Design a protein around this ligand. Sequence first.
Ligand SMILES: C[C@@H]1O[C@@H](O[C@@H]2[C@@H](O[C@H]3O[C@H](CO)[C@H](O)[C@H](O)[C@H]3O)[C@@H](O)[C@@H](CO)O[C@@H]2O)[C@@H](O)[C@H](O)[C@@H]1O
Ligand SMILES: C[C@@H]1O[C@@H](O[C@@H]2[C@@H](O[C@H]3O[C@H](CO)[C@H](O)[C@H](O)[C@H]3O)[C@@H](O)[C@@H](CO)O[C@@H]2O)[C@@H](O)[C@H](O)[C@@H]1O
Ligand SMILES: C[C@@H]1O[C@@H](O[C@@H]2[C@@H](O[C@H]3O[C@H](CO)[C@H](O)[C@H](O)[C@H]3O)[C@@H](O)[C@@H](CO)O[C@H]2O)[C@@H](O)[C@H](O)[C@@H]1O
Ligand SMILES: C[C@@H]1O[C@@H](O[C@@H]2[C@@H](O[C@H]3O[C@H](CO)[C@H](O)[C@H](O)[C@H]3O)[C@@H](O)[C@@H](CO)O[C@H]2O)[C@@H](O)[C@H](O)[C@@H]1O
Ligand code: CA
Ligand code: CA
Ligand code: CA
Ligand code: CA
Ligand code: NA
Ligand code: NA
Ligand code: NA
Ligand code: NA
Lengths: 292, 292, 4, 4
Amino acid sequence: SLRRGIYHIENAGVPSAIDLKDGSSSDGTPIVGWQFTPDTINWHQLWLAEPIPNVADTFTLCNLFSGTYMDLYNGSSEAGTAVNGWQGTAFTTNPHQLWTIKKSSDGTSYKIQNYGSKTFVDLVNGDSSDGAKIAGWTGTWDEGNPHQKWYFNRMSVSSAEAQAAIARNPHIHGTYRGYILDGEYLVLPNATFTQIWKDSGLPGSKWREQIYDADDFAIAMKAAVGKWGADSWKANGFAIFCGVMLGVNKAGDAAAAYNFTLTKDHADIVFFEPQNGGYLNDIGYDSYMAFY
Amino acid sequence: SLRRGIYHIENAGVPSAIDLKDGSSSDGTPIVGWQFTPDTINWHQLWLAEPIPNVADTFTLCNLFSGTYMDLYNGSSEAGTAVNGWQGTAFTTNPHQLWTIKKSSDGTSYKIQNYGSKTFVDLVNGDSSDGAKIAGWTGTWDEGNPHQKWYFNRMSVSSAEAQAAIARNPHIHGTYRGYILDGEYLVLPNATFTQIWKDSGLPGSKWREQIYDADDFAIAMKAAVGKWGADSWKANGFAIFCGVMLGVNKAGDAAAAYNFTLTKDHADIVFFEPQNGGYLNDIGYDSYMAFY
Amino acid sequence: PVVR
Amino acid sequence: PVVR
Ligand SMILES: C[C@@H]1O[C@@H](O[C@@H]2[C@@H](O[C@H]3O[C@H](CO)[C@H](O)[C@H](O)[C@H]3O)[C@@H](O)[C@@H](CO)O[C@@H]2O)[C@@H](O)[C@H](O)[C@@H]1O
Ligand SMILES: C[C@@H]1O[C@@H](O[C@@H]2[C@@H](O[C@H]3O[C@H](CO)[C@H](O)[C@H](O)[C@H]3O)[C@@H](O)[C@@H](CO)O[C@@H]2O)[C@@H](O)[C@H](O)[C@@H]1O
Ligand SMILES: C[C@@H]1O[C@@H](O[C@@H]2[C@@H](O[C@H]3O[C@H](CO)[C@H](O)[C@H](O)[C@H]3O)[C@@H](O)[C@@H](CO)O[C@H]2O)[C@@H](O)[C@H](O)[C@@H]1O
Ligand SMILES: C[C@@H]1O[C@@H](O[C@@H]2[C@@H](O[C@H]3O[C@H](CO)[C@H](O)[C@H](O)[C@H]3O)[C@@H](O)[C@@H](CO)O[C@H]2O)[C@@H](O)[C@H](O)[C@@H]1O
Ligand SMILES: [Ca+2]
Ligand SMILES: [Ca+2]
Ligand SMILES: [Ca+2]
Ligand SMILES: [Ca+2]
Ligand code: NA
Ligand code: NA
Ligand code: NA
Ligand code: NA
């Protein structure tokens, strides 16, 4: 099954993602194919998939930016029916906004079926143009048609996945304890993590004994990423990944505070020094506490 | 002995505190007697006392606001010698800025002796006026003269004292772990703690599932108090007290994040809800983690 | 429970 | 050690 999470949904035939046009929250905003840049935040092209209780493999798809839902216009089963952004809720019974998402016949891409109409999300004519129509269309679960096949590029981790990434790190102290705060996290490209740091005012901040030392920098950076999350996105039900760690050196006679993020493949953590914006695989401390 | 810490230094005879005039960092700024308001931050009247290694009962006294040191002008032993703010360092060998501070004959107030001159800090003529001269003056350790007696009203806690206050609270979970970040903390009046919250932008913030929920409010409030500390004070070697806690309810089926501060008498913690600015003795959770 |  |  598709897991709860945030996805960048990419056509199997051409490099077009599912895009809410101009990120608009207006009801009836067209959802279109659009080109994308890997290893960025594609602002209008992220979708939170919420599983529906007691309906197998069926989800709402909420645009992270607008907070509006993928909606099959009037639930029509006619081929060519508009797919738009529309106001809704995460656990709606409105079948216009319910989508059954299961693996295609290639076992890697998915098909997206409207629960009401039983028609499929279709990049019409496989058009690679920016702004190409996406429609509900006749189809089957088993056919090869790439117009109706979609790669669900997972952009989020669960708290379980974040925990596993920390646990396989070689710089964790014997006494380590972690404290999980949220359930599902958007993983930032380092380019975006760096931009939030650059815009926080921390690059200008001076180290001062106790009054603005390592713990102040690390907590400020976590607060800055929290503020950015709320200010940037209108959807709810996820957080932005940014951890704080406390660490102790090999000799056991110095301790530090710093941040951490996750690799592109979501498998490993990377340390971030908020005093200088550096990313490190070894920050010279073993972590004895984290909260994230 | 006087402990390392931040003090409001109050004359034993009249309600005048030791005040760095206008908080000025200029060398030779007069240090004067001035009236004060209890249960506020008296901005020009806080002094960080740093003990000198291997010199018994002897300290530098750094004005928290200016970052400049109490200085006996040219170290003169003449009665009436100016006491001023002057640039220095926490562990100076400059005897103009070194002060032996021991209990007076009443066993509650102190006398303040310049280490070089062996004269005493004196509120001249016991003048209660705002801006009254404070001078180095002839005296003895044992005499009753209230012009030369000073109550050292302790405004800070050690991390050991903060730990003891948490430990005697009745709302601590069996599994509690605390993580100490700094050594010596200025304890805020609730009026100041509230002002920092009011000026943080948190009063306007809306609760949102995961993306700005309890953990975001509590970490934002700690970051806001950290920023206020660095921006407000020029001295180094202390922090502002503001804790984050994670808690779990009696039933063990809900958890929350919130802040905490300390009572006036420094003996107990008080919980702070950053979602509504309320202070509580019981916030309906038992703390299983804190960092402060 | 989750911190909420 | 203290977090510094
Ligand atoms: C190139 C073209 O691909 C297929 O046709 C698709 C359409 O396919 C879908 O709709 C048709 C009916 O129009 C049929 O139900 C099919 O099973 C279903 O997958 C559709 O994707 C549209 C819009 O993008 O484009 C093409 O017309 C195939 O059936 C055609 O024979 C032909 O190979
Ligand atoms: C009211 C007055 O109090 C005392 O005199 C103080 C001064 O006391 C100090 O200096 C004198 C010498 O001038 C002497 O060395 C004394 O032991 C020492 O405490 C001083 O505090 C000044 C400035 O504030 O005010 C008074 O002159 C006392 O000795 C006087 O007899 C008289 O009772
Ligand atoms: C917020 C906005 O994002 C970008 O423009 C979007 C655009 O973004 C995608 O397409 C562009 C090329 O037009 C790039 O490939 C980006 O990497 C894609 O994410 C689309 O989403 C369209 C249609 O909804 O809206 C634009 O606003 C960027 O070019 C803007 O400067 C700006 O940052
Ligand atoms: C920062 C400044 O603080 C106050 O003025 C100070 C003044 O503060 C003390 O004396 C006033 C009465 O003049 C009150 O009792 C305060 O409670 C005291 O802390 C002195 O420190 C003088 C001399 O250095 O400087 C003033 O700036 C306050 O009145 C101002 O509005 C302002 O907040
Ligand atoms: Ca949470
Ligand atoms: Ca600190
Ligand atoms: Ca510290
Ligand atoms: Ca959160
Ligand atoms: Na429309
Ligand atoms: Na389901
Ligand atoms: Na002067
Ligand atoms: Na000493």
